[PDB]
């Protein structure tokens, strides 16, 4: 039994880098410090399918083939497609993501990541009004007001509160006792149960509440007696708590990206945070989901100039979320083929998008059995980043941390699979 320390967790955007892996032989049999979710990714669950070989669908049955045969058929699909969609990316490393961008240019494809079903509305908002952020260490060391707006970190980023709120920092040496914790959610979540202030607002009315808070912040009267189920007097009191902060942080999630208004909910929250700086130091951090969703948007932006929904059909990059996003291309029946990598749209896209996936060729670069592999024509299994393969990942506030190879696998990495696919698409295009 060996203990591998300083391991990086390949699950959520908290990107914990203090994991200890318990290794027996060449198998990760346990962990220390990782939460229930992180531990579940690291260890193998008895009975779960881990594919050892690539597969191709014939009728309703699948046949095992070599990497050469599977990659050749995948390349033929991509090369002959007029509007191929290359989606997922958030659960692989930055080098594999960069090969993806070059392959999308070669195939004249649309390349898009999980941001289109997640913090894509936050990306649309930050492009219009800005992005006032900080790194986790500034929260730990300075924050006296912590807000979780439309996120449930106890269930979705389980060590986030222990690392940023209960932690004793340089100017907040009493930890939890030196901070005012605010949670904004229509449900009484396990995260709201720990708060000093729980604003249990009416669902789909965050935009209305934020309009009232901003008008109040700028010295105007709130037109109505109650907004989003919160009385006028309590809105005024919440604004005073924010104005009296020495250092405030607004963490936010799917509660405002998925609900009525989408990107405009984030837009109004960003503008409130910016204007609060005339009274108190304020910043925000989007609660980025997967451990490397952030890395895709960084890589795609630095290479093409745009973060997601990037269309290379005309050679030059073009960007239009609402037209060039994965759900737009599937629901409007524009995409004629789809390559999925390190994502599960079969499980996580709405029914209307699944109806299109049933009618077009689907390639899945995936290690496990999922709803997407149930809808796939070709399955190509890789070595898993953070366990069996190394590479850069970006934390939710942009901090880059290198993922580690803890054990060995006979499978190819995502980067290797994509490089072989790029060579074959080039051959078919010629």
């Amino acid at each position: 039994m060996e203990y591998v320390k300083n391991v990086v967790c390949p699950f959520c955007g908290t990107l914990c880098d203090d994991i200890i892996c318990k290794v027996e032989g060449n198998e990760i049999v346990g962990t220390i410090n990782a939460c229930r979710i992180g531990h579940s990714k690291f260890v193998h669950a008895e009975g779960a399918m881990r594919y050892k070989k690539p597969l191709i669908r014939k009728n309703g049955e699948f046949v095992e083939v070599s990497y050469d045969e599977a990659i050749d058929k995948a390349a033929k699909i991509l090369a002959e497609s007029k509007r191929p969609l290359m989606y997922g990316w958030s659960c692989t490393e930055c080098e594999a993501q960069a090969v993806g961008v070059e392959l999308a240019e070669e195939a004249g494809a649309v390349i898009d990541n999980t941001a289109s079903v997640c913090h894509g509305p936050s990306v649309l908002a930050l492009q219009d009004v800005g992005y006032p952020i900080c790194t986790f260490g500034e929260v730990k060391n300075r924050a006296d007001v912590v807000v979780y707006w439309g996120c449930n970190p106890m269930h979705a980023h389980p060590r986030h509160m222990s690392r940023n709120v209960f932690a004793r920092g340089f100017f907040r040496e009493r930890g939890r006792s030196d901070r005012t914790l605010i949670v904004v959610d229509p449900r009484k979540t396990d995260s709201a149960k720990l708060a000093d202030i729980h604003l249990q607002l009416d669902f789909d009315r965050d935009y209305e509440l934020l309009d009232a808070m901003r008008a109040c912040l700028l010295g105007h009267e709130i037109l109505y007696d109650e907004v989003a189920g919160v009385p006028r007097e309590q809105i005024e009191e919440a604004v005073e708590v924010l104005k009296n902060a020495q250092f405030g942080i607004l963490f936010f999630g799917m509660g405002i990206t998925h609900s009525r208004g989408k990107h405009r909910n984030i837009d109004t929250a960003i503008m409130m945070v910016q204007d609060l700086n005339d009274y108190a130091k304020w910043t925000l951090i989007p609660m980025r989901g997967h451990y490397n969703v952030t890395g895709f948007n960084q890589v795609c932006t630095w290479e093409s100039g745009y973060p997601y929904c990037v269309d290379f059909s005309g050679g030059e990059p073009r960007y239009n979320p609402g037209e060039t996003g994965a759900n737009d291309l599937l629901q409007n029946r524009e995409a004629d083929a789809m390559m999925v990598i390190a994502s599960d749209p079969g499980a996580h896209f709405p029914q209307r998008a699944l109806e299109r996936m049933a009618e077009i060729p689907v390639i899945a670069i995936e290690p496990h059995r999922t709803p997407t592999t149930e809808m796939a024509d070709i399955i190509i299994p890789p070595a898993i980043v953070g366990m069996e393969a190394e590479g850069t990942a970006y934390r939710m506030e942009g901090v880059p941390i290198r993922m580690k190879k803890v054990v060995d696998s006979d499978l190819l990495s995502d980067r290797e699979i994509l490089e072989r696919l790029l060579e074959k698409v080039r051959e078919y295009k010629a």
């Binding site: 004793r168 100017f171 040496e173 009493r174 930890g175 006792s177 020495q246 250092f247 130091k281």
Partner: protein
């Protein structure tokens, strides 16, 4: 020697001597357990009993060991243990050593400000005050000429205290009017003059033309009072006087303390606090004390898991103790 359990309360009785423990008054200081010469008492953890939900009583008294001497009842700074001999409490029997302490308010000096009632950490004070009725703090006459009134409703809307009422209605051919009456409640009116000034037809006549004494009482509950001295210090006219049971010292190691807040929550005298920095980047004392309010009970020290706070006790205020057994027991609590 038997025992009767009434919820969380404990009674140890022998036949006559009766020791009663009231769980709701116990601060879990541990002094009764420390003083007992036969080690009959076991006190549960201080932090756990204060910060979490527990079905157990704060202390356990072993019937087979207790000899009903009354030392635990005498030392308790919180009136939670009472020994009765033939129906009379030992606090009324001069032969039993008694700790010297007091708390009183001079009613002639008191101005019924209520600051001591707010500050008292055990809610032991009741300050009552009789404010005069609002009508007796204003003087004027007001009347509305109902024939001139056109029922525009502007006085009713603008009145700051809702003293004006109009009997609004939908007109009918039999009653072709928008209202049937208008009235001023003279007990509510504060003679501000707003109504007469807004009236568009000058239907309102309003004219402005020695205040009674504020009486009251004070009461300190002797069972809840712990002689902390917050009332004496907060009083703006020095009407409250307090004498404490013990004298001693508190010592805090700021580096050992990890600011869990247990001692702050445990302290029944509100001695301990976490000061907030006034400006960004300023640093404060991690655990702040003000010994003017301390009674040296030892609950804070007992609750701390890292032993960052210690209590020294230099004197227990009594007249000279005659019994050697009692003198030795009281002396063992000095440190």
């Amino acid at each position: 020697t038997t025992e009767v359990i009434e919820g969380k309360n404990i009674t140890v009785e022998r036949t006559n001597r009766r020791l009663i423990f009231q769980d709701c008054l116990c601060a879990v200081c541990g002094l009764c357990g420390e003083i007992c010469p036969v080690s009959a008492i076991e006190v549960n953890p201080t932090g756990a009993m204060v910060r979490t939900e527990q079905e157990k009583s704060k202390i356990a008294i072993d019937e087979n060991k207790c000899v009903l001497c009354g030392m635990c009842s005498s030392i308790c700074p919180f009136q939670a243990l009472d020994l009765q001999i033939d129906g009379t409490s030992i606090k009324e029997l001069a032969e039993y050593p008694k700790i010297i302490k007091s708390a009183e308010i001079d009613d002639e000096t008191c101005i019924q400000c209520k600051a001591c009632e707010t500050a008292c950490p055990q809610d032991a004070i009741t300050i009552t005050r009789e404010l005069p009725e609002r009508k007796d703090l204003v003087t004027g006459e007001i009347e509305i000429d109902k024939d001139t009134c056109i029922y525009c409703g502007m006085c009713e809307e603008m009145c700051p205290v809702d003293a004006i009422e109009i009997d609004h209605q939908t007109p009918s051919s039999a009653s072709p009017v928008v209202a049937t009456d208008i009235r001023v409640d003279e007990d509510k009116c504060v003679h501000c003059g707003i109504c007469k000034r807004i009236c568009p037809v000058d239907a309102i006549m309003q004219v402005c033309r020695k205040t009674p004494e504020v009486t009251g009482t004070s009461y300190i509950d002797p069972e809840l009072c712990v002689n902390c001295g917050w009332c004496q210090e907060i009083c703006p006219v020095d009407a409250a006087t307090v004498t404490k049971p013990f004298e001693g010292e508190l010592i805090i190691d700021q580096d050992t303390c990890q600011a869990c807040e247990t001692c702050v929550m445990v302290c029944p005298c509100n001695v301990l606090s976490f000061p907030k920095p006034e400006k960004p980047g300023e640093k404060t004392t991690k655990l702040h004390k003000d010994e003017r309010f301390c009674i040296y009970c030892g609950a804070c020290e007992r609750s701390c898991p890292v032993t960052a706070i210690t209590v020294k006790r230099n004197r227990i205020n009594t007249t000279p103790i005659r019994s050697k057994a009692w003198k030795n027991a009281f002396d063992s609590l000095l440190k």
